[PDB]
Design an enzyme around this catalytic site. Structure first.
Site, PDB file in Angstrom:
ATOM      1  N   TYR A  19      33.742   5.911  36.765  1.00  0.00           N
ATOM      2  CA  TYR A  19      32.688   5.437  35.879  1.00  0.00           C
ATOM      3  C   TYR A  19      31.751   6.546  35.419  1.00  0.00           C
ATOM      4  CZ  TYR A  19      29.076   3.034  33.440  1.00  0.00           C
ATOM      5  OH  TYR A  19      28.206   2.630  32.456  1.00  0.00           O
ATOM      6  N   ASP A  45      40.011   5.045  40.821  1.00  0.00           N
ATOM      7  CA  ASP A  45      39.286   3.773  40.706  1.00  0.00           C
ATOM      8  C   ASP A  45      38.698   3.553  39.314  1.00  0.00           C
ATOM      9  OD1 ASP A  45      38.121   1.447  42.507  1.00  0.00           O
ATOM     10  OD2 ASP A  45      36.466   2.140  41.249  1.00  0.00           O
ATOM     11  N   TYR A  50      34.517  -0.363  32.619  1.00  0.00           N
ATOM     12  CA  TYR A  50      34.147   1.045  32.466  1.00  0.00           C
ATOM     13  C   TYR A  50      34.456   1.629  31.085  1.00  0.00           C
ATOM     14  CZ  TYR A  50      33.909   0.862  37.609  1.00  0.00           C
ATOM     15  OH  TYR A  50      33.637   0.540  38.915  1.00  0.00           O
ATOM     16  N   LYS A  79      39.733  -3.668  37.850  1.00  0.00           N
ATOM     17  CA  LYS A  79      38.897  -4.756  38.320  1.00  0.00           C
ATOM     18  C   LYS A  79      38.703  -5.803  37.240  1.00  0.00           C
ATOM     19  CE  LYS A  79      36.179  -1.444  41.098  1.00  0.00           C
ATOM     20  NZ  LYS A  79      36.174  -0.268  40.186  1.00  0.00           N
ATOM     21  N   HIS A 112      35.553  -7.792  40.473  1.00  0.00           N
ATOM     22  CA  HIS A 112      34.538  -6.737  40.408  1.00  0.00           C
ATOM     23  C   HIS A 112      33.249  -7.179  41.080  1.00  0.00           C
ATOM     24  CE1 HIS A 112      33.359  -3.043  37.811  1.00  0.00           C
ATOM     25  NE2 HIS A 112      32.569  -3.100  38.870  1.00  0.00           N
ATOM     26  N   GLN A 185      35.321  -3.696  48.206  1.00  0.00           N
ATOM     27  CA  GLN A 185      34.670  -2.487  47.723  1.00  0.00           C
ATOM     28  C   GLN A 185      33.191  -2.782  47.518  1.00  0.00           C
ATOM     29  OE1 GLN A 185      34.558   0.014  43.586  1.00  0.00           O
ATOM     30  NE2 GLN A 185      36.603  -0.151  44.498  1.00  0.00           N
ATOM     31  N   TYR A 211      31.497   2.613  47.707  1.00  0.00           N
ATOM     32  CA  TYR A 211      31.052   3.210  46.453  1.00  0.00           C
ATOM     33  C   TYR A 211      29.589   3.651  46.524  1.00  0.00           C
ATOM     34  CZ  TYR A 211      28.763  -1.092  44.622  1.00  0.00           C
ATOM     35  OH  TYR A 211      27.967  -2.193  44.418  1.00  0.00           O
ATOM     36  N   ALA A 213      28.936   6.444  47.509  1.00  0.00           N
ATOM     37  CA  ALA A 213      28.966   7.146  48.791  1.00  0.00           C
ATOM     38  C   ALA A 213      28.209   8.465  48.745  1.00  0.00           C
ATOM     39  CB  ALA A 213      30.394   7.386  49.226  1.00  0.00           C
ATOM     40  N   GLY A 215      25.420   8.623  46.877  1.00  0.00           N
ATOM     41  CA  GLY A 215      24.059   8.244  46.537  1.00  0.00           C
ATOM     42  C   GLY A 215      23.894   7.680  45.140  1.00  0.00           C
ATOM     43  N   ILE A 272      34.763  18.265  41.967  1.00  0.00           N
ATOM     44  CA  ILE A 272      36.000  17.513  42.161  1.00  0.00           C
ATOM     45  C   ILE A 272      36.881  18.195  43.205  1.00  0.00           C
ATOM     46  CG2 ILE A 272      38.203  16.880  41.124  1.00  0.00           C
ATOM     47  CD1 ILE A 272      36.756  16.328  38.513  1.00  0.00           C
ATOM     48  N   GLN A 274      35.866  20.516  45.340  1.00  0.00           N
ATOM     49  CA  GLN A 274      35.134  20.575  46.594  1.00  0.00           C
ATOM     50  C   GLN A 274      35.351  19.288  47.384  1.00  0.00           C
ATOM     51  OE1 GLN A 274      30.588  19.827  47.656  1.00  0.00           O
ATOM     52  NE2 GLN A 274      30.825  21.682  46.420  1.00  0.00           N
ATOM     53  N   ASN A 275      35.349  18.155  46.684  1.00  0.00           N
ATOM     54  CA  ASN A 275      35.400  16.862  47.365  1.00  0.00           C
ATOM     55  C   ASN A 275      36.685  16.628  48.164  1.00  0.00           C
ATOM     56  OD1 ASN A 275      32.786  16.259  46.595  1.00  0.00           O
ATOM     57  ND2 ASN A 275      33.372  14.931  44.890  1.00  0.00           N
TER      58      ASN A 275
HETATM   59  N1  LIG Z   1      32.677  -2.067  42.407  1.00  0.00           N
HETATM   60  C1  LIG Z   1      31.471  -1.664  41.942  1.00  0.00           C
HETATM   61  O1  LIG Z   1      30.649  -2.483  41.573  1.00  0.00           O
HETATM   62  C2  LIG Z   1      31.168  -0.224  41.845  1.00  0.00           C
HETATM   63  C3  LIG Z   1      29.841   0.211  41.748  1.00  0.00           C
HETATM   64  C4  LIG Z   1      29.601   1.571  41.691  1.00  0.00           C
HETATM   65  C5  LIG Z   1      30.669   2.447  41.726  1.00  0.00           C
HETATM   66  N2  LIG Z   1      31.916   2.015  41.812  1.00  0.00           N
HETATM   67  C6  LIG Z   1      33.007   3.006  41.827  1.00  0.00           C
HETATM   68  O2  LIG Z   1      32.682   4.079  42.746  1.00  0.00           O
HETATM   69  C7  LIG Z   1      32.630   5.326  42.004  1.00  0.00           C
HETATM   70  C8  LIG Z   1      31.594   6.302  42.594  1.00  0.00           C
HETATM   71  O3  LIG Z   1      30.376   5.646  42.932  1.00  0.00           O
HETATM   72  P1  LIG Z   1      29.191   6.184  41.974  1.00  0.00           P
HETATM   73  O4  LIG Z   1      29.568   6.023  40.491  1.00  0.00           O
HETATM   74  O5  LIG Z   1      27.912   5.362  42.217  1.00  0.00           O
HETATM   75  O6  LIG Z   1      28.911   7.777  42.092  1.00  0.00           O
HETATM   76  P2  LIG Z   1      28.966   8.593  43.494  1.00  0.00           P
HETATM   77  O7  LIG Z   1      30.443   8.645  44.113  1.00  0.00           O
HETATM   78  O8  LIG Z   1      27.978   8.104  44.481  1.00  0.00           O
HETATM   79  O9  LIG Z   1      28.629  10.105  43.066  1.00  0.00           O
HETATM   80  C9  LIG Z   1      27.326  10.150  42.475  1.00  0.00           C
HETATM   81  C10 LIG Z   1      27.112  11.549  41.875  1.00  0.00           C
HETATM   82  O10 LIG Z   1      27.477  12.534  42.841  1.00  0.00           O
HETATM   83  C11 LIG Z   1      27.744  13.754  42.126  1.00  0.00           C
HETATM   84  N3  LIG Z   1      28.657  14.536  42.951  1.00  0.00           N
HETATM   85  C12 LIG Z   1      29.993  14.318  43.128  1.00  0.00           C
HETATM   86  N4  LIG Z   1      30.467  15.199  43.966  1.00  0.00           N
HETATM   87  C13 LIG Z   1      29.474  16.020  44.376  1.00  0.00           C
HETATM   88  C14 LIG Z   1      29.395  17.115  45.248  1.00  0.00           C
HETATM   89  N5  LIG Z   1      30.518  17.572  45.912  1.00  0.00           N
HETATM   90  N6  LIG Z   1      28.216  17.706  45.415  1.00  0.00           N
HETATM   91  C15 LIG Z   1      27.137  17.273  44.787  1.00  0.00           C
HETATM   92  N7  LIG Z   1      27.168  16.246  43.960  1.00  0.00           N
HETATM   93  C16 LIG Z   1      28.300  15.598  43.734  1.00  0.00           C
HETATM   94  C17 LIG Z   1      28.362  13.336  40.760  1.00  0.00           C
HETATM   95  O11 LIG Z   1      27.729  14.056  39.695  1.00  0.00           O
HETATM   96  P3  LIG Z   1      28.784  14.933  38.823  1.00  0.00           P
HETATM   97  O12 LIG Z   1      29.627  14.068  37.976  1.00  0.00           O
HETATM   98  O13 LIG Z   1      27.863  15.885  37.909  1.00  0.00           O
HETATM   99  O14 LIG Z   1      29.685  15.809  39.820  1.00  0.00           O
HETATM  100  C18 LIG Z   1      28.036  11.808  40.676  1.00  0.00           C
HETATM  101  O15 LIG Z   1      27.366  11.469  39.459  1.00  0.00           O
HETATM  102  C19 LIG Z   1      32.262   4.903  40.570  1.00  0.00           C
HETATM  103  O16 LIG Z   1      32.610   5.922  39.637  1.00  0.00           O
HETATM  104  C20 LIG Z   1      33.165   3.665  40.437  1.00  0.00           C
HETATM  105  O17 LIG Z   1      34.522   4.080  40.207  1.00  0.00           O
HETATM  106  C21 LIG Z   1      32.193   0.727  41.869  1.00  0.00           C
HETATM  107  C1  LIG Z   2      27.441  -1.447  31.959  1.00  0.00           C
HETATM  108  O1  LIG Z   2      27.890  -0.714  33.073  1.00  0.00           O
HETATM  109  C2  LIG Z   2      27.883  -1.320  34.308  1.00  0.00           C
HETATM  110  C3  LIG Z   2      27.492  -2.688  34.403  1.00  0.00           C
HETATM  111  C4  LIG Z   2      27.487  -3.404  35.588  1.00  0.00           C
HETATM  112  C5  LIG Z   2      27.887  -2.743  36.776  1.00  0.00           C
HETATM  113  C6  LIG Z   2      28.278  -1.409  36.701  1.00  0.00           C
HETATM  114  C7  LIG Z   2      28.270  -0.695  35.485  1.00  0.00           C
HETATM  115  C8  LIG Z   2      28.631  -0.978  38.020  1.00  0.00           C
HETATM  116  C9  LIG Z   2      29.082   0.399  38.401  1.00  0.00           C
HETATM  117  C10 LIG Z   2      30.574   0.483  38.652  1.00  0.00           C
HETATM  118  O2  LIG Z   2      31.321  -0.443  38.873  1.00  0.00           O
HETATM  119  O3  LIG Z   2      30.957   1.764  38.788  1.00  0.00           O
HETATM  120  C11 LIG Z   2      28.455  -2.049  38.847  1.00  0.00           C
HETATM  121  N1  LIG Z   2      27.999  -3.158  38.116  1.00  0.00           N
HETATM  122  C12 LIG Z   2      27.731  -4.427  38.644  1.00  0.00           C
HETATM  123  O4  LIG Z   2      27.767  -5.386  37.876  1.00  0.00           O
HETATM  124  C13 LIG Z   2      27.379  -4.746  40.055  1.00  0.00           C
HETATM  125  C14 LIG Z   2      27.698  -6.013  40.566  1.00  0.00           C
HETATM  126  C15 LIG Z   2      27.314  -6.360  41.858  1.00  0.00           C
HETATM  127  C16 LIG Z   2      26.599  -5.442  42.637  1.00  0.00           C
HETATM  128 CL1  LIG Z   2      26.090  -5.886  44.221  1.00  0.00          CL
HETATM  129  C17 LIG Z   2      26.275  -4.182  42.136  1.00  0.00           C
HETATM  130  C18 LIG Z   2      26.659  -3.838  40.837  1.00  0.00           C
END
Ligand SMILES: NC(=O)c1ccc[n+]([C@@H]2O[C@H](COP(=O)([O-])OP(=O)(O)OC[C@H]3O[C@@H](n4cnc5c(N)ncnc54)[C@H](OP(=O)(O)O)[C@@H]3O)[C@@H](O)[C@H]2O)c1
Ligand SMILES: COc1ccc2c(c1)c(CC(=O)O)cn2C(=O)c1ccc(Cl)cc1
Ligand SMILES: COc1ccc2c(c1)c(CC(=O)O)cn2C(=O)c1ccc(Cl)cc1
Length: 315
Positions: A19, A45, A50, A79, A112, A185, A211, A213, A215, A272, A274-275
């Site tokens: 995302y 993912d 997205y 999702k 989702h 998730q 997710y 993870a 911050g 990327i 580094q991770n």
């Molecule tokens: N199911 C859901 O509702 C939901 C909600 C949130 C997220 N997700 C999924 O989980 C994924 C990740 O969660 P998230 O989007 O909240 O972001 P995240 O994994 O918590 O990472 C947040 C930020 O960390 C930075 N970062 C990454 N690697 C780093 C490193 N080695 N050192 C320092 N900074 C670093 C990135 O900035 P840079 O891009 O500049 O590296 C990124 O914007 C999302 O992309 C999505 O696919 C799902």
């Molecule tokens: C327009 O862009 C959006 C809109 C809604 C979004 C997101 C992004 C994300 C980030 C992602 O999945 O990476 C979660 N959303 C949620 O609805 C959500 C649902 C339940 C909970 Cl507890 C937290 C977030």
């Protein structure tokens, strides 16, 4: 480096988050997903939400064609968005994701969010007062349709996202349940470690996938501006110095050692790469307990309006 799911399939414990907010050009998704695969990511993912499945699907297609990987090597997640909870809308939604990504199947299809929204073409349906319109759906019927998607071969595995214990139990206790969700998730990091939910999930052989993870991306649309920045945490930073890694790597390793599958979003080549170093070192047991102490029930995703949704997970 995979965990065996309760349906027999395998999920790589480290996944690439895709995302990115709208200000980021859609071409970037294509670029960075290729970099992630090149760096060693195999779990990817994505989501209908997205607006990037086309670009992510292309990246995979491209890396398959140049011989870097085979389709069976990739674990691709999509999702079901919340406007598509009504059972008759589930398969068509999946088929649309498959068409966009030019894939024959997804390895994992998730609900989702449990917070159902008005069926329609808008991702966020709003009334004439600008208020987002909720819908009422028995998620067990949604799950039934998900099950049919797994049998239809369109999803190798099925699971949920942003469910709490009660909501998970509604599925687990559904009469005539065919397939348990392979995973849940949810937001998970040292400031919101979900330890109780994790324990429950383990007892039911359901994988917790983390997710935000690292911050979260601190998107203005849902972040608390005053919330602390995870990766600036003194304890995490001290641990990073101790192990000669980075705060991010400490945070990802934390999840791996507690039996959590962990996502990491980065659109930066060097971060990327580094991770993937998360597999190169170990935290001590004492390290783990220290991080465990950081929990502050902090979610980086906030919504006053959704807090009133009957299926709001944090109530
Ligand atoms: N199911 C859901 O509702 C939901 C909600 C949130 C997220 N997700 C999924 O989980 C994924 C990740 O969660 P998230 O989007 O909240 O972001 P995240 O994994 O918590 O990472 C947040 C930020 O960390 C930075 N970062 C990454 N690697 C780093 C490193 N080695 N050192 C320092 N900074 C670093 C990135 O900035 P840079 O891009 O500049 O590296 C990124 O914007 C999302 O992309 C999505 O696919 C799902
Ligand atoms: C327009 O862009 C959006 C809109 C809604 C979004 C997101 C992004 C994300 C980030 C992602 O999945 O990476 C979660 N959303 C949620 O609805 C959500 C649902 C339940 C909970 Cl507890 C937290 C977030
Ligand atoms: C453009 O399409 C969407 C779709 C869903 C969206 C949003 C935008 C936003 C941003 C905004 O409304 O300002 C929040 N959403 C959520 O459902 C949401 C619910 C709960 C939580 Cl914890 C966070 C986000």
């Amino acid at each position: 480096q995979c965990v065996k799911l309760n349906d027999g399939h395998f999920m790589p414990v480290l996944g690439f988050g895709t995302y990115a907010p709208p200000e980021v050009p859609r071409s970037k998704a294509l670029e960075v997903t290729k970099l992630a695969i090149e760096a060693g990511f195999r779990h990817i993912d994505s989501a209908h939400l997205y607006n990037n499945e086309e670009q992510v699907g292309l990246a995979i297609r491209s890396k398959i064609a140049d011989g870097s990987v085979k389709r069976e090597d990739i674990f691709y997640t999509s999702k079901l968005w919340s406007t598509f909870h009504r059972p008759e809308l589930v398969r068509p939604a999946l088929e649309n994701s498959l068409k966009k990504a030019q894939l024959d199947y997804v390895d994992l299809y998730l609900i989702h969010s449990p917070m159902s929204l008005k069926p329609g073409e808008e991702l966020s349906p709003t009334d004439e007062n600008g208020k987002v319109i909720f819908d009422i759906v028995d998620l067990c019927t949604t799950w039934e349709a998900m099950e049919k998607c797994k049998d239809a071969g369109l999803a190798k595995s099925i699971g949920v996202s942003n469910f709490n214990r009660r909501q998970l139990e509604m599925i687990l206790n559904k009469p005539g349940l065919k397939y348990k969700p392979v995973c849940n998730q949810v937001e998970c990091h040292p400031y919101f470690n979900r330890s109780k939910l994790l324990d429950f999930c383990k007892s039911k052989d359901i994988v917790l996938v983390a997710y935000s993870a690292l911050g979260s991306q601190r998107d203005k649309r849902w972040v608390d501006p005053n919330s602390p920045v995870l990766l600036e945490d003194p304890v995490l930073c001290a641990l990073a110095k101790k192990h000669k890694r980075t705060p991010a790597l400490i945070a990802l390793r934390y999840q791996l050692q507690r039996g959590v599958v962990v996502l990491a979003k980065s659109y930066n080549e060097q971060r990327i790469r580094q991770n993937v170093q998360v597999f190169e070192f170990q935290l001590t047991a004492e390290d783990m307990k220290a991080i465990d102490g950081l929990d502050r029930n902090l979610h980086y995703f906030n919504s006053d309006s959704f807090a009133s949704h009957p299926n709001y997970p944090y109530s």
